[PDB]
Structures are given as C-alpha cells and as structure tokens.
Design a protein around this ligand. Structure first.
Ligand SMILES: [Zn+2]
Ligand SMILES: [Zn+2]
Ligand SMILES: [Zn+2]
Ligand SMILES: [Zn+2]
Ligand SMILES: [Zn+2]
Lengths: 110, 191, 171, 157, 56, 141, 96, 43, 316
C-alpha cells in the first residue's frame, strides 16, 4: 500500500502540471524507493548510508567522511559501478561496453 | 649482602659510562632513600638547568624512578618535592640489555671488515655493492663502471680495518668482565 | 640448472595478420620472442618442446588499436641459476676484481675477495691470467665455480660465484 | 639457497597445462644435451616439411644446420650445446636409462640425483661437499658404487 | 600539398614511429611523402559528425 | 649531478638547440626540419595567478589567529607556545627593526623605494662585527 | 570548453562508453603509471632507460603492472596517500 | 533505464486543496515526516 | 606522447581502501625532511633534505627529478616522511578512536562485558561491521567498570573513566572524583594491548586497518607534483599552503624535541605538544570546528587537502 500510494502521489504532481510521463519511468522510480523495505529517502542520507562502493557514495556529496570510514573499516570496492569506472578512466559496462568483442579463427576460413 | 652488590654495580656503570655529577646524584640517592629536589640543588650548588639534564639522563636509562610528593605544611603552600628513588631491577635489566646490545653491535662490525665486497665512487659520491658492480660490467672495458658517471669504481673496505673491530671486542670484554661478573652474582638471588 | 616447464605467453598480432594461416604466424612469433630471450621468473629460456601440439585456445580482441591477444600454453626447456650451486665454466673476460666465468648463457662473476690467498692476479701476461701456487687461470681454461648468489631481474640475470672452498678452482 | 627450498615456480609440486599434478623435472648435463639435440632434429624435420609446399666438428656443423632453421636469434643455445658437449661424458639414451635406474634406486630428490649425475666425482666426500643437501640422506659406500658403475659407463668419444 | 593555410589541407603528420611533424616549417624541408600506417590530421571538412550541445 | 635536460633534434643534430616555442599549441619545435621537440607545455603565468625571497629568504611561517567557531582559550595557548619557540631563531630583530624603520619612514613621508633601499641596507649590515653596537638608533638613521 | 557532469550523464544516457573514455582520456589528460603486485600503490620506481623497476618497501623487482589513469585520478591517489589513506589498485579480482 | 527515468521525471519539473508543484515534489522525494496539507478522501 | 614501457598493460579492477601504517609510510618514503626552509641557502636549486628537495618530484620541465629521472611530464612523484617524537591524532578519526576508548578497557585492554552476556551474543551475530561497532558501543559505553569474575573472563576491574572530547584532546573522568587527561602515548599503549578478537569484533582487518595505525606517528610528505610551487620573475617565488603547513610541523616537531631533550618544564612540553597537534590537525583539516583557524601571511585561510576534496569544482 505504501508503494501504490507513493506512485499516486508522484503521478498527481505530474498530472497537475499538465504534463504526460510514461508509466515505465515513474514505476522504476517508485520501485527503487521501496526495494529495501519501508520508504527510503532520496537524500545524501538515503543512498550514501548503504554500500555501493566507496567511490560511488563519496562522489555525490560528503567525500572525505566516506573515504575516511572506508579506509578505517577496510572496505573493498567491486569497481563495476558507473562513477568508479569513470574515475579510473577506462571502459564501463554500459551499452557498447557491456559486452566484449571476440574473434573466431574458425570463421576466417569461411 | 646482595643489595650492596647492586649499589657497587650502579657505581661501576654510572661511574664508568658517565661523568662525575651523575655519580654525585647517584650517591646522593644512595645516602638518602628519599632525596628532595631542593636538597640536591643546595647540595651540589648547581643550577636548575644543570640539575635537569642529570635527572633526565638518570631517568632515561631506567636507573631511578621519581616520586612527586605533595606538601601542604605551614604557609598552606602546595609544595611539591620530587623525591628520587633507586629502581634496582629496572637498572640491572638496563645494564644487562645495554651490555648485550654493545656486544651484538660490536660483533656485527667485525664481519663487515672480514671480507671486502662493495665498491665506492668518488665522482658522484654514491656507494655501489658487488652486485651492481658486476651488473655494470662492460665488454669493451676492464673495470666496473658507474651508471651515474660511467667511470671505473674503487674497491671499498679492506682487511686493515678488521684489526680495529677485534681490539674493540677484546678491550670491551676486559672492561665488561667485572660488570658481567657482578651481574651473574646478582642474578643468582633474583633481587 | 636445465629444467623443463610449461609456460604461457600472451601474443599480440596486428589486424593485417588475420589470414587463415595465422596460426602458423602465432607459432612463428611464439618462437622469435621466446627462444633465446630471458625472464626473471623462469630463467634463461633455451628451447621450446612440442611444436606440433601447440594449444591456441581462443583469441580475444582488445578495445583500441584492434590488435589481437592470444594466450598460449606450451612446454619449454629453460635454464635457471640457483644460489650455492656448483657449476662449471670457461673464462671469457678478465678483470682485476676477478675473472668472468661463462656458464652456458650466463656470465657469472667471481670476486677477488672470494678467492684463496694463493691465487694472485697477473697482468703482465697476454691475456692477463690469475696464477696461483699450482693452477693458472686463463681464458681458455676450465674452472669449476660454486655460485653463491643469483639476481633475477626482468629479462636480465647475473650471478656471483666463488672458488675459495675446497674441491673447486680450475678443472 | 641450496637447502631443498627453491622458488615458487621451482617447487617440488608442479602443474601441467592440462590441470594434473606433476613432480619437478630435474635434468643433469647428460640427457639434457640429448633432449635439446633431440628436439632440434624433429624441429628440422618440421622446418623441411613445410618447405616442400671429431666430436666438435659434427657438433658445430649440426649447430649451423640448425642455426639456418632458426631466425638467427638463439645462438646462446648453440653455445650452450658446446658447453654441455665440452662438459658431457655420457651418450645414448639407453645408458641414461641405466643411470636413472641407479639414481632412483636410492630414493632421493630429483634435484639431488640431477646434481649427482651432472658432477664428476671419485669419492663420496666430493659428492657430499659439492652437494650440501646430501651429507646424511644416503650412505657413502652406495655413492661410491654409483660412481664406480658410472665410471664404467663413461667412454672417451 | 595544400598547406595549413588553405581549408582543404592538413596541420600535422604522425609517422608510424609515433612522432609528429608539423606542416609549418616543413615546407622549408621540401617534400613530405606519406606511407601506409601514418596518421595525418586534417581540418574539419564536410560530412563529419560532431556532437552539438547547449548548457545546462 | 647532471640533472640538466637539453632538448636536441635527433634528425638535425647540426647545431645546439635553435628552436621555437609554440605556446598556443603547447609544444616546442625545431625551427629547421619542423619536427616537434616536446608536447604538453607547462605555463608559468597560470600557476602565478593564485599568488619575499629578497628579504625573508627561504624561511616559511604561518600565522595562528582566532577561528570562526573556536574558543579564546585555545588561541592564547597556541600563541604562548610560539612565544616559547620565538627564541629558536634570532629573526625577531629584523621584524621589529623593520617595524620601527617603517614607522620613521612613514613619519618622514618618504617614498616606498627609499624604504626598500633602507631595509635592504639594514639587511646588508644586520649584525656584523664592525658595527659593535650603536644602540639600534644610529644604524637606523 | 568544460565537459561537466551533466554532459557525462547524457553520454551515459546515450550508452556510448567509448566516446566517454576517449573524451575523458585522450581528449583531456592521460597518464601512465606502474603499480606493484603485492601492494597496489604507486611506489614503483621506474628507471626504464635500462628497463629497470622497483617498488620500495615490499621487495619486488619482477611483478610490475602498467596502468593508464587520468592525471587527476593520480592527484587523488597521491592526496589520499598524503592523507594517510591507501588507494590500493589491483588488476586481478581477489574477491571473485 | 535509470538515467532515462530520472530525466523523464526531472524534465517536467522545469515546466513547474493540497499543495502541488515543486514544494510537493520536494516533500515526496525527501519523504518528509510532515506535509503542507495532510488531507484525506473518505469514501 | 610519453615514453614506452615494457610492463604488462592491464585495466584497474578492485580498489581497496585502508589506513596507512607508519612502518609502511617509512618503507614508501625516501627522505626525512628536517629543514623547514624551501630552497637552498644560495636562493637557487633545492634545499636537499627539506620541504621540496630533488628526492621528491619536480616541475619546471628542465629539472630531472633525481630518483625517477625522466621528466616532470612522466614523474609520478616521490614520497617523503616526518618522524615525530610525540604521537598525534588524526582529525577524521578523533571520534572513532574515542568510540574505541568507550569499547575497550583502559588498562587490561579487553572488551567490556563478555561473550557470556546475552545482549553481546545477539549483537555479535550481526554481519554488518558498522552496526556491530554501533551496538557494541551502545552497550560498552554504559558499563564503566571492567570486572574480574562474571557468573555464567579477564581480570582488571579498574574503573573505566568517561572519555570526553575537548580541544582536540580526550579527558577521562573517574568517579571513584579523579579526572585525568588521557595522553596520546597512553591511548596508543592500550591500543597496542588489544587482542585480535577485540578489534576484529569492532570492524577492523589486520592486513588493512589497526587501532594503533589510527593514531598518527609518522607523516607522509607529498611531492611537489601535488603542491607545485612557482618562481615568478625569479624574485617573486610562491609556495603552496601545504608547504607552509609542513614547515609548521617541522618547526613544532624540532621545537618539541629540543624542549624534551634538555630539561622538562612540563608546561612548555604541553604547549609544544598542542602546537604540533594543531599544526598536524590543521594540516589534515584546517576547517575544524571548535579550533582556531590557521591564516596565511597574505590574508587568506590555509588551503588544506580536505578543502581540495570537499567543496564543489574541486577534485571530484
Ligand atoms: Zn659515479
Ligand atoms: Zn629539427
Ligand atoms: Zn609494491
Ligand atoms: Zn620522480
Ligand atoms: Zn579491564
């Protein structure tokens, strides 16, 4: 019921503005706010207080605190996040780079 | 008794490895079990800046422990008096460990001069070992060059310096034999 | 020591070498780079056994440049020195710090201080030779050297030997 | 050092490219020459297959015929062949099989028997001084016997 | 052969060795012949897709 | 020990570097064969934008003053700590002497050039042996 | 011109990672550094005029990795090392 | 799809009984413990 | 355009964040940095052994950076160090250390309560490290007495004091009331007596983080590639703020060593210790609340590393 009610609340402001937005986007947004149980705020206290990699959380707002807690607690980063691959300066798993291209030597003789 | 042999040990070590004022303070504590700071100042007639480094040196060697005793007598003045006390076991342990470190540090210097290995470079003032020497050997040259200077090196170390490290061991043993004998005499009763 | 070990190497090929015969090229490269060279982890690579049954696995395309990367697993005969290893060799170059013994593809050096007292250096001879109380160490002479230490740098390996101990010296 | 404790890739436990476990292969300077000189022959057959569509002179001549096979970038292997040949006293793989039969009969480490077969000694003290790992792992009389049979297996070629 | 001054020209050449020669002061040398494997930097001609953007 | 980077053209090698520096492109190029000598040129004007060796030398120091959110007790404890370390260097006479000389020059309405020349002269004299006193007034005048 | 954060977010919205990598490396700044196998820090002294490498404090002269990171990221790592924080980099996945 | 949704929701925010508009959107996204107009619809 | 290298080229995958151990700092560094001066006495080159010596990195292109050689466009930089004679605390950890002081005994160095307590048994079952340290802190912060015998255990019993943060310091209050200020050496000693299960039950990993490592003992010195100085007109040379902070750390450290070598006024030692703690604290984070703000001689606040990593349009 909290989920459906949240969807109604968001949809209301959209329809009030006199605009149309597809069901997909609003559904995705609502679901993200409810996948950890309860209601989760969209804040710097609402996704930087849960693990996603030290870089991904530190990039948004409070950099030094997140980094210090990371080094203190010996945290490990998986480094498949978007911002992480951006910072390191190499290909990320998004779109074209979400798959590797290979070669088949058995196909060259065709 | 065993307690007096510790006193003679502290006299031999403090007298043997430090100046005179150190055994002045040391004996000043051996005469009075609780020696105030004002008594040592009016005794040796030394300044505060002269009594400081002496007590700090006797405390850095774990020879004596201090006891800052409170005072609230006559004029209601919180007169604090640093009473010095001889710390026998920590001082004996300090003497034994220091002797062991002297023997070990004087034994390592003998193995270095027993066989020359490394080299030296006068031009860039950089030291090179035998490894870098054989790694900087060329075919068109007959001597070990230097990456910084590409010029020949000079053999470092020699057998003449090996005669100095042995005399330090013999003289150190002849000057440490009574001390280590007193240590072996005190360590029998573990006091 | 002359050991045999299965080694793996990543071969890079230019996009111009993608013909049907490319496998041969691989082996070609697999020879030209591996045989004769040296590695600080496996020693001097001598030969490469098993040339017909060379595994090719699967080639992968790295992003930019478009070059192809391959992971090859093969069997090879390599030579790796070890510390405190009695070997034999022949002198090549002579120096006042000691003569340079040649053991296979490795040029070991023997320090003068690591030599007995009776062995003295002689520069008046041509070539300069080390003359002792019974043996004369010359270039073409064979000397049994006991290697004391070895250095394993990348693509470069040098060792240090000695002949002071018994059962050593000239052969 | 020389205390039966080599590196990581040189440990007693080795793994082949198939995934199975294999003991470390240690070779002495006897069959080590017949294996290089051996494989270079089949390598010459492989070089002449795709082409369609006294003891020192033969050594250097064969090393030249095999140098023409390679791309002139591995002459240290040929100089190593001259080193081994100048320091080798063994010949024929049958006698080498006998030598392995005499080395494996004592139950020693492959590196130890490699140092045994690679060194020319007359007494047991020589083998115990040149090989620091062998000093009490095997009897001295047995080592002297092995050196006797080996002394009968060596022949001036 | 046109030069950096003219629009249908180039600015820098990059040999296969990974070295850049500027077309300026290169006319003092005389002739510059291209080979297979080099990278010549040309000017933006026609039919060249580029990203267009407007903040924010 | 060396540490001197000298740019030369390996293709020309006919004369010491007679080169030209292209700042707009950020390169340095030989003015003969036209071959570039270095890419990615650094600037000195750009690092200077954010910001005295002739008098202060290589000495560095930093002030401690009160903060936005702080206590007055900590400001005094830090200044008293510097008051105990002020004897570590004998440079207190230069700042006080330059302060009083600053007051006299500002009282005489002399330009800043005479002030800097007088400060430079007092820095050249400072505390030498041939001075041997004069009670700080005569060396200032 | 400045390629801000919103522009990068638009490039992610289009799904073009190669143009983002090229724009954030070759089009701006690209640096090459060496890291050590045991510790993922940039202490690897590289004297490659004779092909020589070291890493101080962990006894390595063989296993040295080469990585291409932007200069700003190297400034971040060096500032973290100046701030007593270890940004260890590993080319292999130990967690699996 | 996350960036496309965040844009598909953020773009109509530029054109902007109970409170509507940007303040209401702030209360919804922040998940505030109190609303500007806490009303019900009793059927 | 950089020079070719023979090292194998790979991408950057896993990134591990951990604290810098003082031994590793001394193993990474190459210089000691003892002279607070910038350049040499001859107003040229470098001081050689100072704030910016050739043992670190260099700029100006023409210089070669002794220990990498190559050039500035290739030099990653090199690290120095500073060996202090008195341990100092790190700003971003002052709270955490305090929490540790409220989670472990101050004498025998053992965790308060025990595994026999039911609440501790329930709290230890949590897999999240931060929540474990949080709840265990909520339990251990109340009990102010270690105990020797607990019915169904270590000894001690000494009344655990109340640790309060005041002026970058930690004051301990005993009721018994005897209030004594906890020094850095005492806290570091107690941290040296912490067993494996103790700090690993708090959320520490032996190979990466240690409570002893949280207390700063040796300080890394970043190369000029991080703080590039300028020499404009050869007579107007500007040094970065971090360079001035390093000069302050050197002057306070040498001053404290000089005051602790000959004599001991007991008060000037605490003034110099708080001075060095202030220079290191402002070096790590100048914008610290409740503490004075260090200001440069030009009239602007000192630019710290945290300021470079905090505000917008910075490094992130
Ligand atoms: Zn030199
Ligand atoms: Zn030129
Ligand atoms: Zn390392
Ligand atoms: Zn450098
Ligand atoms: Zn306790």
């Amino acid at each position: 019921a909290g989920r459906a009610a949240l969807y109604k609340e968001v949809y209301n402001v959209i329809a009030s503005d006199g605009s149309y937005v597809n069901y997909r986007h609003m559904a995705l947004l609502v679901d993200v706010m409810t996948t950890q149980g309860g209601l989760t705020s969209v804040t710097r206290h609402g996704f930087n207080r849960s693990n996603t990699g030290a870089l991904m959380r530190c990039s948004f707002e409070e950099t030094v605190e997140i980094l210090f807690e990371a080094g203190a607690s010996a945290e490990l980063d998986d480094c498949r996040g978007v911002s992480e691959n951006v910072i390191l300066g190499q290909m990320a798993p998004i779109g074209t780079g979400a798959f590797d291209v290979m070669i088949d030597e058995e196909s060259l003789v065709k | 008794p065993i307690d007096d042999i510790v006193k003679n040990l502290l006299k031999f070590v403090v007298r043997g490895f430090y100046g005179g004022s150190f055994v002045l303070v040391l004996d000043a504590i051996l005469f009075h079990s609780v020696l105030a700071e004002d008594d040592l100042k009016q005794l040796l007639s030394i300044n505060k800046t002269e009594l400081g480094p002496l007590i700090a040196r006797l405390r850095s060697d774990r020879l004596i422990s201090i006891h800052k005793q409170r005072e609230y007598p006559p004029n209601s003045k919180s007169v604090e008096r640093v009473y010095y006390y001889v710390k026998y076991p920590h001082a004996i342990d300090a003497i034994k460990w220091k002797v062991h470190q002297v023997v070990q540090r004087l034994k390592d210097d003998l193995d270095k001069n027993s066989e020359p290995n490394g080299y030296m470079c006068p031009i860039c003032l950089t030291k090179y070992t035998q490894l870098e020497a054989v790694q900087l050997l060329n075919f068109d040259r007959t001597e070990f060059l230097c990456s910084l200077c590409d010029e020949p090196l000079v053999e470092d170390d020699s057998g003449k310096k090996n005669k100095e490290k042995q005399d330090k061991l013999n003289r150190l043993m002849d000057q440490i034999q009574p001390i280590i004998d007193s240590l072996k005499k005190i360590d029998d009763s573990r006091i | 020591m002359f050991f045999i070990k299965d080694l793996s190497l990543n071969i890079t090929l230019h996009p111009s070498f993608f013909g049907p015969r490319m496998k041969q090229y691989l082996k070609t490269k697999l020879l030209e780079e591996v045989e004769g060279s040296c590695t600080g982890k496996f020693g001097y690579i001598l030969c490469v056994l098993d040339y017909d049954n060379i595994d090719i696995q699967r080639g992968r395309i790295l992003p930019t440049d478009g070059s192809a990367e391959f992971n090859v697993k093969y069997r090879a005969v390599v030579f790796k020195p070890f510390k405190g290893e009695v070997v034999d060799g022949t002198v090549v170059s002579c120096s006042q710090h000691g003569f340079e013994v040649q053991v296979g593809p490795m040029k070991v050096f023997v320090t003068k201080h690591l030599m007995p007292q009776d062995l003295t250096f002689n520069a008046g001879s041509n070539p300069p030779s080390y003359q002792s109380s019974e043996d004369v160490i010359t270039i073409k002479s064979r000397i049994r050297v006991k290697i004391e230490g070895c250095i394993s740098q990348v693509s470069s390996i040098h060792a240090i030997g000695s002949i002071k101990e018994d059962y050593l010296g000239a052969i | 050092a020389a205390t039966l404790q080599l590196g990581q890739e040189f440990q007693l436990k080795q793994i082949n490219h198939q995934g199975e476990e294999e003991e470390l292969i240690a070779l002495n300077l006897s069959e080590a020459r017949l294996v290089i000189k051996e494989a270079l022959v089949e390598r010459r057959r492989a070089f002449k297959r795709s082409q369609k569509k006294t003891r020192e002179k033969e050594l250097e001549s064969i090393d030249v015929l095999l140098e023409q096979t390679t791309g002139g970038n591995n002459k240290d292997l040929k100089n190593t062949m001259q080193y081994l040949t100048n320091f080798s006293r063994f010949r024929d793989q049958e006698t080498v099989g006998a030598v392995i039969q005499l080395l494996k009969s004592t139950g020693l480490h492959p590196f130890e028997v490699a140092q045994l077969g690679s060194l020319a000694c007359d007494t047991a003290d020589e083998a115990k001084t040149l090989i620091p790992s062998l000093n009490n792992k095997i009897s001295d009389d047995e080592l002297e016997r092995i050196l006797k049979e080996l002394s009968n297996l060596e022949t001036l070629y | 052969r046109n030069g950096p001054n003219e629009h249908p020209g180039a600015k820098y050449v990059i040999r296969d060795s990974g070295d850049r020669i500027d077309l300026r002061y290169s006319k003092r040398a005389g002739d510059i012949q291209l080979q297979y494997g080099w990278k010549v930097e040309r000017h933006i001609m026609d039919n060249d897709p580029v990203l267009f953007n407007r903040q924010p | 020990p060396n540490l001197n980077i000298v740019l030369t053209c390996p293709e020309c090698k006919v004369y010491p570097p007679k080169i030209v520096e292209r700042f707009s492109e950020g390169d340095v190029v030989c003015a003969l064969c036209g071959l570039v000598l270095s890419d990615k040129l650094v600037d000195t004007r750009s690092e200077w934008r954010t910001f005295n060796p002739l008098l202060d030398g290589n000495n560095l120091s930093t002030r401690i003053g009160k903060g936005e959110t702080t206590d007055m007790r900590f400001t005094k404890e830090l200044n008293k700590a510097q008051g105990k370390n002020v004897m570590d260097k004998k440079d207190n006479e230069v700042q006080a002497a330059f302060a009083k000389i600053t007051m006299l020059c500002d009282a005489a309405e002399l330009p800043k050039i005479v002030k800097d020349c007088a400060k430079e002269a007092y820095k050249l004299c400072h505390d030498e042996k041939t001075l041997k006193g004069k009670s700080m007034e005569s060396i200032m005048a | 011109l400045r390629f801000g954060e919103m522009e990068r977010d638009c490039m992610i919205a289009h799904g073009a990672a190669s143009f983002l990598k090229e724009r954030l490396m070759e089009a701006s700044d690209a640096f090459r550094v060496h890291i050590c196998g045991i510790c993922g820090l940039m202490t690897v002294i590289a004297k490659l005029n004779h092909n020589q490498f070291e890493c101080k404090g962990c006894d390595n002269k063989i296993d040295i990795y080469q990585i291409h990171i932007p200069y700003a990221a190297k400034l971040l790592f060096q500032e973290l090392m100046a701030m007593n924080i270890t940004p260890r980099l590993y080319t292999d996945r130990s967690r699996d | 799809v996350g960036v496309l949704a965040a844009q598909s929701i953020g773009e109509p925010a530029t054109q902007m009984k109970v409170t509507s508009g940007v303040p209401r959107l702030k209360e919804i996204l922040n998940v505030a413990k109190n609303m500007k107009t806490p009303s019900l619809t009793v059927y | 355009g950089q020079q070719y290298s023979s090292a194998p080229l790979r991408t950057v995958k896993e990134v591990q964040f951990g604290l810098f151990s003082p031994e590793e700092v001394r193993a990474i560094s190459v210089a000691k940095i003892r002279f607070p001066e910038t350049m040499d006495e001859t107003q040229t080159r470098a001081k050689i052994g100072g704030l910016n010596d050739p043992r670190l990195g260099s700029i100006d292109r023409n210089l070669k950076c002794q220990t990498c050689q190559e050039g500035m466009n290739e030099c990653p930089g090199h690290f120095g160090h500073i060996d202090l004679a008195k341990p100092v605390f790190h700003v971003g950890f002052i709270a955490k250390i305090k929490k540790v002081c409220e989670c472990v005994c101050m004498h025998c160095g053992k965790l308060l309560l025990d595994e026999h307590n039911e609440l501790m048994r329930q709290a230890l079952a949590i897999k999240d490290s931060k929540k474990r340290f949080a709840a265990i802190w909520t339990l251990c912060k109340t009990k102010m007495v270690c105990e020797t015998d607990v019915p169904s255990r270590g000894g001690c019993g000494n009344t655990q004091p109340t640790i309060r943060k005041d002026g970058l310091k930690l004051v301990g209050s005993w009721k018994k009331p005897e209030l004594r200020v906890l020094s850095t050496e005492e806290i570091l000693n107690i941290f040296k007596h912490i067993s494996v299960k103790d700090f690993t039950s708090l959320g520490f990993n032996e190979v990466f983080s240690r409570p002893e490592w949280m207390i700063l003992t040796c300080l890394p010195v970043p190369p000029p590639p991080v703080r590039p100085s300028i020499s404009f007109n050869e007579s107007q040379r500007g040094e970065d703020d971090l360079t001035f902070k390093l000069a302050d750390i050197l002057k306070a450290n040498i001053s404290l060593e000089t005051l602790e070598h000959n004599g001991a006024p007991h008060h000037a030692i605490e003034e110099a210790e708080s001075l060095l703690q202030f220079h290191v604290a402002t070096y790590m984070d100048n914008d610290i609340a409740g503490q004075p703000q260090a200001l440069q001689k030009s009239g602007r606040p000192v630019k710290s590393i945290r300021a470079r990593l905090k505000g917008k349009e910075g490094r992130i």
